[PDB]
Design a binder for this molecule. Sequence first.
Ligand SMILES: Nc1ncnc2c1ncn2[C@@H]1O[C@H](COP(=O)(O)OP(=O)(O)O)[C@@H](O)[C@H]1O
Ligand SMILES: Nc1ncnc2c1ncn2[C@@H]1O[C@H](COP(=O)(O)OP(=O)(O)O)[C@@H](O)[C@H]1O
Ligand SMILES: Nc1ncnc2c1ncn2[C@@H]1O[C@H](COP(=O)(O)OP(=O)(O)O)[C@@H](O)[C@H]1O
Ligand SMILES: Nc1ncnc2c1ncn2[C@@H]1O[C@H](COP(=O)(O)OP(=O)(O)O)[C@@H](O)[C@H]1O
Ligand SMILES: [Mg+2]
Ligand SMILES: [Mg+2]
Ligand SMILES: [Mg+2]
Ligand SMILES: [Mg+2]
Lengths: 97, 446, 443, 49, 439, 426, 35
Amino acid sequence: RKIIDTFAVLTPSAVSLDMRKLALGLNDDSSVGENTRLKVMQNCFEVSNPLHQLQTKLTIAFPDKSLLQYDCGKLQKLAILLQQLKDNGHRALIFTQ
Amino acid sequence: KSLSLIAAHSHITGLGLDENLQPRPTSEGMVGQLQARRAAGVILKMVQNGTIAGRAVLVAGPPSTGKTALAMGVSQSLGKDVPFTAIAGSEIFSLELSKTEALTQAFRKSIGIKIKEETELIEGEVVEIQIDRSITGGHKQGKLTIKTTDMETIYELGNKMIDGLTKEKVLAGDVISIDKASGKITKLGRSFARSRDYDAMGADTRFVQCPEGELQKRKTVVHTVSLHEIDVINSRTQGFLALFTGDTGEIRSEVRDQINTKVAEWKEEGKAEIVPGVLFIDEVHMLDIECFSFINRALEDEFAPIVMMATNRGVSKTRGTNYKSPHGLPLDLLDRSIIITTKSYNEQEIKTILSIRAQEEEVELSSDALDLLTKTGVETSLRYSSNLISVAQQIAMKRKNNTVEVEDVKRAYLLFLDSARSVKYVQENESQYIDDQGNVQISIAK
Amino acid sequence: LKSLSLIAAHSHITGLGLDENLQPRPTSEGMVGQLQARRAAGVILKMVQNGTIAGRAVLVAGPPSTGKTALAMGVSQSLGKDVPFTAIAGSEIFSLELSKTEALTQAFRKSIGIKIKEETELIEGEVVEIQIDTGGHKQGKLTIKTTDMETIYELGNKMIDGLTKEKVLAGDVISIDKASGKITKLGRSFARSRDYDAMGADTRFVQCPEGELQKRKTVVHTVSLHEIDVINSRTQGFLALFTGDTGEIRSEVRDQINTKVAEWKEEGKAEIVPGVLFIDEVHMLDIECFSFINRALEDEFAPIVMMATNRGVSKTRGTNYKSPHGLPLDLLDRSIIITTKSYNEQEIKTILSIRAQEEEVELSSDALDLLTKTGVETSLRYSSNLISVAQQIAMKRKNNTVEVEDVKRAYLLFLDSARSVKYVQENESQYIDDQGNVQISIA
Amino acid sequence: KLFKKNNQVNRVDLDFLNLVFTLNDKDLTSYHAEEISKLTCVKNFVEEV
Amino acid sequence: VTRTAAHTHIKGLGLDESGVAKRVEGGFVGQIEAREACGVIVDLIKAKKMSGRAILLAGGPSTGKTALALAISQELGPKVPFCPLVGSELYSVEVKKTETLMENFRRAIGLRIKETKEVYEEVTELTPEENPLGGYGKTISHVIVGLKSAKGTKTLRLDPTIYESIQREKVSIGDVIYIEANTGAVKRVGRSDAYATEFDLETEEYVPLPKGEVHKKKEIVQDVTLHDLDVANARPQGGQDVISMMGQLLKPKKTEITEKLRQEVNKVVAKYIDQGVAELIPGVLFIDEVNMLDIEIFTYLNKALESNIAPVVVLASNRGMTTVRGTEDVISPHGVPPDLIDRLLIVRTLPYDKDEIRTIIERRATVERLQVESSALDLLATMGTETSLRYALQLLAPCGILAQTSNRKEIVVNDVNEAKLLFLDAKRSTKILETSANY
Amino acid sequence: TRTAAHTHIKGLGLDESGVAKRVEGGFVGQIEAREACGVIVDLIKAKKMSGRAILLAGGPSTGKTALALAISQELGPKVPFCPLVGSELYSVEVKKTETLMENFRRAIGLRIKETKEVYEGEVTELTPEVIVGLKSAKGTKTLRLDPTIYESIQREKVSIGDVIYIEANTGAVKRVGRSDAYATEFDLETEEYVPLPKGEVHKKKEIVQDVTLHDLDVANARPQGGQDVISMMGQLLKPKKTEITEKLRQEVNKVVAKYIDQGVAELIPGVLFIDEVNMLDIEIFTYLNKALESNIAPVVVLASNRGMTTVRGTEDVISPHGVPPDLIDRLLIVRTLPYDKDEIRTIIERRATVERLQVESSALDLLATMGTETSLRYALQLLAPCGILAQTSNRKEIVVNDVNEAKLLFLDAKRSTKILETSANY
Amino acid sequence: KALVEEIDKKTYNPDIYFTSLDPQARRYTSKKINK
Ligand SMILES: Nc1ncnc2c1ncn2[C@@H]1O[C@H](COP(=O)(O)OP(=O)(O)O)[C@@H](O)[C@H]1O
Ligand SMILES: Nc1ncnc2c1ncn2[C@@H]1O[C@H](COP(=O)(O)OP(=O)(O)O)[C@@H](O)[C@H]1O
Ligand SMILES: Nc1ncnc2c1ncn2[C@@H]1O[C@H](COP(=O)(O)OP(=O)(O)O)[C@@H](O)[C@H]1O
Ligand SMILES: Nc1ncnc2c1ncn2[C@@H]1O[C@H](COP(=O)(O)OP(=O)(O)O)[C@@H](O)[C@H]1O
Ligand SMILES: [Mg+2]
Ligand SMILES: [Mg+2]
Ligand SMILES: [Mg+2]
Ligand SMILES: [Mg+2]
């Protein structure tokens, strides 16, 4: 789990809806039976999936959280100074325009 | 339409001819090749007749003498609504399908059928939908109101189509088309009614619409489908997906026989028409003896389209065998076909072609520049000049002048080499390139 | 006529024509001549019927159309049913899904079968009229009736839990085992035929079974080793016994099956019947195939291998050198060769008469003599087909018997190989040459 | 819709006449089938006939 | 408005009752001996006795072998199967060539079967259903359904299972259905046409009422091939679970059908034949350019021909003394190994003559609906005799196009000359190919 | 930093007039080739032509691959650039022509603009139909959702009090995590906590994401759906790639043409580079000949170092650079010249200064003489062992002793062949 | 239907769908509409 969380990043560049459902023939209009399509979808929903987390990680990716501190030159020095100041029991007023 | 950048045959627009099948000296893109042009026109008329099947014509000649150009011309002059499948000989060898199956699919793709049906249609502006719940007296009490340009009328829904209009969020005040038998609802956008009510929607609705006529009429729907599409459709549960994924996988012969019988029954039942298009094969010498043997029999079938072939070589060794044959084709296949030959090109014809290419690539040429390009084309080749003319445009723009002069052409000639010059340079310094046996000298000294 | 054969190429042959002392009679059971080969084949048949010898290579060699395939067909017919006889050709070995060795191993495994017995007990005749009324569906009793027995059985919680699923209408003949298994639906009594007017897709009317309720039976199944391997290979491998996509069964399954068969034979539940693997046109086969056979012949689970070939000193496929019979000397060493000789005029005449008798064709004496003469000058199969062609000729002429005129018309209507070769040689220009040079134009 | 118009007019159900027997291995036993075949052959409808 | 392709001007062998071939009948001219031999062969095929006979036609290109085989197929009739193939068609990619050869071998013989069925067809009313008195939580004893039809109505009683099948179909009360009591399956034909205009719109097609008696007794006769049964058993279509339908979703690729399945199919077919229910009919397998076959398929043909239910195979070849493909030092006639040509019979086809070529050109012109002159026809015949028979037949159509362009209905000498100058043949192309620098 | 035989070349080093300076952009010499490459670069930037085909021919160690890389780097990251070798076209599951066409489609690009609608925040209620009562830090709104997105929600084991993040365009669902409000429920609770998102629950954004034609061709050729189990099993059903029918390509072309006509997207043709074209066979050459005369083909550049050799796949067809004459006829040839002593010395100096190494003048002259005597690549590669040998002696500057010891330790091709010929045991 | 749709939790009758050009914006049965 830890490895698959850390090293799964890439997502498809382009996706086309109404094609995943059409691949299996399970849609509103298809040559398969109207009720035969219901049995298989019910069975599939009852079927569990052990690869779900990989599916979530390979569809939408979030741009981390720490990089906000990393991506600004002033923020790193501000964090260092604030940590040093708090460890010594001080309080600060910040000013900006 | 069909957004494209440029093609080597972009200027060609449907051959060039008269009402008497006579070729003009210069018309619709191509020049010269009068006899070949008239032969292509005769073949085109034969194709348009549609009463003759399985004819093989082989266009042969030296390279760069209007062969693919002639094929593009006949394809364009044939127009749409008639299939034209152009394939290369090197794309039949596949790891998924046997060459026979690929050739059969190519043959079937080139013949189409038009299926005509008659359907009643209901069109007009809808102004209000009313929907009720489930009641003992009636399962669903729903009504629809339709406004045409001249009529307003009330329809009553019969417990199913309400699911049709609730499957997708539709709303009143727009023109829609609904089929009595099919039951499909097609929302064409938004009605006209009052301009202001739909003038602030942020474009959309496909430039709105206005009701035209009455409520219901009777129209004819024609569907054009290739035969190969029919075999793919009937082969599997969902073959229309295979029409894009390309995993048909050697459809069985029983399906093809059933398709043939049913299509014939339709044809003498008056329910469908047949359009026998054209199949064109470039670089036919790249095929195999097995493919030629299969073509020998596939040509004689009733549903055999007109086949055109393009080859360059003369008296070469056919692939899959060990003997030399003319055109790279076996004797029997040559006997089964009709040969159209092409000649070389005159200096005047080369100049006219270069001028056509110039006006096609929005490049202005001075008279002396065109003369120099024509001289180079006569000396070396047509395609070299047809490339130099485009490459000199950037050099011209580098001098901040749009017109192309002699200096630009000279610079392009001295910058980009040619086959003869490259061969001479290679033979002069063969010790630097990699030899046939793989011996190379890299050190400058000694 | 149990098989669907109309008329085979050699269907007149039913076993080898030999007697108790193994001496082959001059003509019996559809075989004529070839006394030495028939005697050798009878010895081979005795060896395979004995079942105490494993992995023997016998090779039948002779010029074409001398009875090698006929001899093997006679051996197979004389061996009788219940004994496997896997007949294949060389060209079938090369496959696009399995390697050559895998296909050879599958053929070897198919060649030998096993008889496995199974003892079971059943209860049949469940014309019940159940009696179930405490709480939770109490009163677990039901009756059982048949022709000679009738008794009431009490029920347990698990028994009624099984009964409620697959409901029994209390008037349908049902079966159940005492092996703590599943109660099996069998059918409905004839008394409930008139009740409805359109029966379902799973309802049948079986008569009331007779005898005793608790029956015990032994059933013997004849299964090849290859079938066992295929069944145990996958989750549902039995379907691959029809589709054929087994896919190179691994060695672990094979050795496990070998141990299982050894245990079954030791316990007396099964017995092995060896068979015969016959290979037509063994001359065309890769050096890899012969290399594999050289070692596969030495296994304990090895059948008797018969091979047929008609080549002289020819090149073996996959190599550059020439060997006798198109086989390496290493394989030829571990085999015994039965050689078939050419045919005599009288034997040819007798074979022609037998074949004509098989097709209900009445030949005149002179017609038969001319046919024998043609079959002596040309090959025998040419005349063998000419008899049927001439029978059709005569039938078109409204005459039952075939005469010399019909035979001569058939001879001049269909061409022998030698005449066709001569005509091709005399007209080389019209036919396509080896270099693809032809002269279509007549002038 | 056009092709599925003359289906039942010339179609014979292969499963009905025991021609697709390949699936009968799934839920049929040998001895039960033998007992059915024993208690199969007519001899009852003819009486009422 | 009828299409033609190198044929359709032949419609038989042109033989009288006695088997004598008329000179010009059925679209054929000449080739008396070959036509007589092919008529004898088709008579033997109609005899329905033999199994595995093999005929091979020999002759130069454009001599009538394919025409002879198509004439045999036309003479046989639509009922008897006729499977045509090219030699190169056997080299499949999905499965080994031997399997494809066996499949096409079995596709040639056919089987005509018959089956008698009862059926019931406007639904009037239906009532479902007694006391449990046992382990039945919910009991539906029987269902009463009434049908209207056209030639009188009738009601009946039917099992709960067919009622659940109806509920699966989910039919209404004013509908027309199709219930087959053989399999106990109900098919909803649709609504009733006379029940129209209940609502202003309705998607479902209303469909008229069934004609005749509701309780229909009928019999059906179908022609299939043993390959159809083999395919049906190898890849069954039944199944409701996920696995079966998802297997149906994958592309159907050919496999190696086992011998045991074929043996069981043969046993079942024989059992049905013995009852008189069905009868078998052998067909014909036709192969073009057998020289395209390699040594492996040629060897396997020996084993296949000597089988028990092999059909009649007709082979075509135009080569002379050539090396059999697949081996490098085996010179054989027609590119067929000596054993195979020892196993079959040979029919020779002779080259045509000037008058025969002229008559063929005239027949093709008549069947193409074209007008020609006697002088023009003579020039065309001389041209064909100078280059090839096929050249004139191919060149006929552009001559017609050129004639139509100048508003003239008859082919004339100048049109033929113009077509000659416009379109070349193999000989002139060969003569002008080597006399040039660039190929 | 990391260097690998390159990254000292930063462009063609041309001026506005197009005249190549003698030394500029990590380049020395090769003036004519650089000018021709700049002309080709301008032609590509014009975005008018289609299917133009040039190849640059010369001996080994002359800068052909360097020229192609410089062209790619000068074009810019905006323009797609597909590099390839001749041996990649021989795939296993698809034919060679299909792979070549796949690369052709991959070569050109399309820049499009799209609007994405997003919902996020804490979940208040979840009632089956699904109705979701989303609540942000300022707004609250209830939404109706499809069964598929409901199944994705269920597979995410979401519950009341979980800040989530739904995307409307694709249906992607991601549970951000437990809301910070319930931060006191278990002293060792494993679940992480996140503050409520800021702003209204519904937001819209405009993005300019780029794509390639092959990307949106394979998009509907085979899917990569996502979190739905049905889509997962559908994409698992077929694991192998397949040849794409021309009908799909035509439909893709029509859709892209409609998009660009609507003023929503623009088309940027790219370059396809093929190094060592001599590995191609006759069939691929013929198919490329056919495919060059198309209306969407990009600019293809080819590299080869061959004399008059036999085309692979043929027996006796000899041609220059191992390219069939018919394909040569529609080609533009760019010559490449060998180097001189001073050029070799300058290149060695540049490669030394990019690798942060100090080489004295005498050592540099010895290296230049060695490069002239043996090869340029050998002299370039012998720099690092010399640096390590200098470092081991606790020094920084390369000395004549260092290059002599490097010569002793490592051998070039000539001496290796000499010791190979004059030996008994192979 | 298009996935993800906004509702305001008021009314929201899945079996009642009323749409018009809003000239009166009144149901035909709002309060037994009659007299
Ligand atoms: N008659 C013509 N009119 C206009 N362009 C021509 C003509 N003949 C040849 N060309 C030019 O030649 C090129 C095509 O050469 P082509 O004849 O296809 O070579 P090949 O015969 O080797 O395939 C095209 O770019 C086209 O512009
Ligand atoms: N002793 C025999 N008895 C009956 N028929 C025979 C005998 N010998 C040969 N034949 C006939 O010869 C044919 C078998 O030829 P065979 O020698 O098997 O050819 P090949 O050697 O090519 O396998 C059969 O059709 C059979 O009728
Ligand atoms: N005796 C004949 N009568 C009429 N047409 C013939 C005759 N012989 C040949 N033909 C015609 O010649 C054409 C080509 O002959 P074909 O049978 O294809 O030669 P091949 O035997 O080499 O295949 C056919 O379309 C056929 O109609
Ligand atoms: N003008 C140049 N300036 C600097 N280095 C060059 C120059 N030309 C070639 N090189 C170097 O020569 C080496 C060989 O170049 P490359 O094009 O990759 O192979 P080849 O020249 O053999 O085709 C490259 O590592 C490159 O750094
Ligand atoms: Mg071309
Ligand atoms: Mg034999
Ligand atoms: Mg033929
Ligand atoms: Mg390089």
